[PDB]
Design a protein around this ligand. Structure first.
Ligand SMILES: Nc1ncnc2c1ncn2[C@@H]1O[C@H](COP(=O)(O)OP(=O)(O)OP(=O)(O)O)[C@@H](O)[C@H]1O
Ligand SMILES: Nc1ncnc2c1ncn2[C@@H]1O[C@H](COP(=O)(O)OP(=O)(O)OP(=O)(O)O)[C@@H](O)[C@H]1O
Ligand SMILES: [Mg+2]
Ligand SMILES: [Mg+2]
Ligand SMILES: [Zn+2]
Lengths: 343, 154, 302
């Protein structure tokens, strides 16, 4: 059957919790965004940036992990045949302790992530300080100046030539103090992606939208994908959310399956349509039920591990302020056509 | 509002051609060719080091010593090649060190007239006894005249 | 012939992608700018700066590659005897991580692209990086490049100071004055924030000749697309101009996206929805048009 395996009921609660936490459900939004991201990664066509916008909890990191695993499995025969090759490299941007973003830390951590999980393939970066060690861990002197680290990163990325460079939580690039411009912080990444010919995919929340369109060059050499949540006005995404709820309900490792579809309004109210947030909520309720050795899921159980109204209100405010700005309509096309005189 | 002609066009075939390998160092023409006032090989090394912005010792240690295939040349490129400076009088001489320096400089510079800067032509007619100085000898008036007139100093 | 070879259909899809990715259409604007640049290079008229503009996607970089190859093959008969005579040097400016453009990095990258040995052991023989500056000057004097291309020249303006925006270029001005090396700064319309000026104009829809040229390049693009059945594209020239504004460079990569998607599905033709899938965003074209309008207004002074 499509439900959870039956012998898991006799297994200890740890096995059931692990099975539920390792279970990834496929829903139309995730599949569509994954297909678009894969087709863009397989061929960039001069693009230097991929902007995967989405809310908090829509599945922007599981999508990155799935894409990375698929690319690695696709290139594994080629990796075996040809050495000095990485299919996908990916790091996460760091929120700085100071008031400005740290580019030196970005360069050194990208170099560490790119080179450390490799066999001792002797490669000489064109910088004096950076080199390998006996244990294989790469080392960067604190005396090394940041443009030199950037040059070493360019040489390493050229030699390895990954298919895509993932930068998760890229919205931290905007943490700039003083009178800096958010443009000036994208040409550096743009130049790094241009000289190396490396497709830099940036994943972030709706506060990454400040990097959407800054200059004509940054707006031409970049494509965007929206990880849209599930709304409530449209019947279609409501039905899809109901289907996802049913799929979660069938895969809940409990003696008697609860009827989660009836409380769809409550589930949508505290999750805003995001599948990931619903997953964490259901995981919390399931672990509570297993801790009480329960056989059912009640409304009080969900209310115990729900989300407070203020958190959801802030969520929904930011979600509207992002979707309204990311929305395209016939007016945005008509005014563009009339601007060129094409109408 | 008639109909134009939809021409087509042609490609460019952006492929860089193949050029002969460039000289690692520069190619300054020696001063004094065909003149009794020809430049010395050691002076040529000093001038080519000045053109590259590096000290002559650094250039010899990091670029000329590795190319040579002698034990004391490879071992002396990590310790300070004092052997080649305490015995630099034989670089412009008629001996084997002069020939090897000429050949390695020719390989580095892709020149064909570097042997004129030494006395290798007179190897079988001239003896090295009392022929070469141990110390540098210069004409200060020559340096001043060459610098004032805008010519290169050699 | 004017069309793509018919033997590539039996070849794997990667071969078709590689063949189409290397096809560089010679639209009239590209060859006209190429002729102007070649005339300026051959006889500089005492100038030392060949500023070239153009919004992203006009084809400046491929123009640089074409000029590089042409000058190399023109000099080719005479480098057999003359060594240390690299014909043309082309580098790409670095976007600074800080507020100000870095000139030490520019000098060291220019030295690296010239294969100059012992960069770490440079010496100053009596400003930013005097040793590297003198080394680059000597390398330009002796290697004697015909032109010194600097792509992405708009990053030179990253100084955030009105009293320093024009003075940031003093290093290049002095390096071109005392070494006699032509500096051709290829950049977008930001470069107008400051010498020979060349404009890489797009195909504006107001002039019917530009429309005819755009339809011509569109047709010759559709002819070279490696599909079993030739996809009709001139009909949606209005669509292809809306999302492109008339730039022959981003049209090429748009068609590359669509062709790769078609080949991955083992398709045979291109429809409207295929182009819509890999089209530029509505807001992206608006921002691009705003920037190009600002550049055109800046350059509109007569
Ligand atoms: N389609 C899915 N199926 C199952 N679990 C999912 C799915 N999408 C997300 N999750 C789970 O939701 C949780 C958080 O989701 P995820 O980290 O992918 O969110 P995100 O959109 O990247 O947000 P954030 O901005 O917080 O990183 C994880 O436990 C993850 O396994
Ligand atoms: N006329 C052309 N024909 C074919 N391909 C082209 C043409 N012009 C540009 N390209 C392609 O575009 C890419 C290079 O970018 P392009 O020349 O379009 O941008 P650019 O505006 O000159 O550069 P940048 O925006 O970085 O200043 C390459 O893939 C190249 O093959
Ligand atoms: Mg995440
Ligand atoms: Mg370019
Ligand atoms: Zn004298």
């Amino acid at each position: 059957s499509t439900g959870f395996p039956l012998e898991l009921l006799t297994r200890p609660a740890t096995e059931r919790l692990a099975y539920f936490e390792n279970y990834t459900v496929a829903h139309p939004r995730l599949k569509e965004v994954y297909e678009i991201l894969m087709r863009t990664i397989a061929e960039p066509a001069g693009a230097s940036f991929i902007f995967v916008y989405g809310a908090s909890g829509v599945g922007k990191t599981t999508l990155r992990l799935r894409v990375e695993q698929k690319l690695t499995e696709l290139a594994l025969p080629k990796l075996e045949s040809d050495r000095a090759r990485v299919p996908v490299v990916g790091i996460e941007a760091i929120a700085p302790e100071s008031r400005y973003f740290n580019w030196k830390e970005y360069y050194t951590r990208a170099l560490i992530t790119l080179e450390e999980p490799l066999i001792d393939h002797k490669f000489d970066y064109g910088v004096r300080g950076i080199s390998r060690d006996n244990f294989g861990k790469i080392n960067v002197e604190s005396k090394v100046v940041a443009p030199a680290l950037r040059r070493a990163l360019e040489n390493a990325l050229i030699h390895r030539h990954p298919d895509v460079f993932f930068v998760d939580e890229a919205q931290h690039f905007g943490k700039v103090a003083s009178g800096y411009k958010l443009q000036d912080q994208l040409d550096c990444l743009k130049s790094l992606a241009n000289m190396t010919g490396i497709l830099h995919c940036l994943l972030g929340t709706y506060e990454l939208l400040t990097f959407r369109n800054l200059s004509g060059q940054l707006s031409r050499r970049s494509v965007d994908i929206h990880f849209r949540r599930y709304c409530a006005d449209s019947p279609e995404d409501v039905q899809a959310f109901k289907s996802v709820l049913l799929t979660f309900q069938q895969h809940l490792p409990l003696a008697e399956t609860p009827n989660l579809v009836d409380h769809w309004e409550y589930f949508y109210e505290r999750t805003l349509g995001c599948i990931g947030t619903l997953k964490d909520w259901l995981k919390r309720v399931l672990s509570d039920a297993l801790d009480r050795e329960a056989t059912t899921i009640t409304l009080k159980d969900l209310q115990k591990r729900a989300l407070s109204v203020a958190q959801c209100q802030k969520m929904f405010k930011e979600i509207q302020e992002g979707e309204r700005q990311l929305s395209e309509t016939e007016a945005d096309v008509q005014n563009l056509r009339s601007a060129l005189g094409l109408g | 509002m008639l109909a134009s002609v939809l021409e087509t066009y042609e490609s460019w075939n952006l492929k860089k051609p193949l050029i002969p390998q460039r000289s690692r160092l520069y190619q300054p023409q020696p001063v004094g060719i065909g003149t009794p006032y020809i430049e010395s090989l050691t002076g040529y090394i000093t001038r080519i080091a000045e053109l590259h912005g590096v000290l002559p010792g650094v250039l010899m240690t990091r670029e000329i010593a590795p190319l040579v295939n002698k034990i004391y040349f490879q071992n002396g490129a990590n310790r300070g090649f004092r052997e080649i400076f305490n015995r630099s009088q034989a670089l412009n001489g008629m001996g084997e060190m002069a020939a090897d320096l000429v050949q390695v400089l020719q390989k580095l510079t892709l020149r064909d007239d570097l042997r004129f800067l030494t006395m290798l032509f007179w190897s079988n007619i001239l003896t090295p006894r009392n022929l070469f100085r141990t110390r540098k000898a210069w004409c200060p008036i020559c340096y001043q005249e060459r610098h004032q007139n805008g010519l290169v100093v050699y």
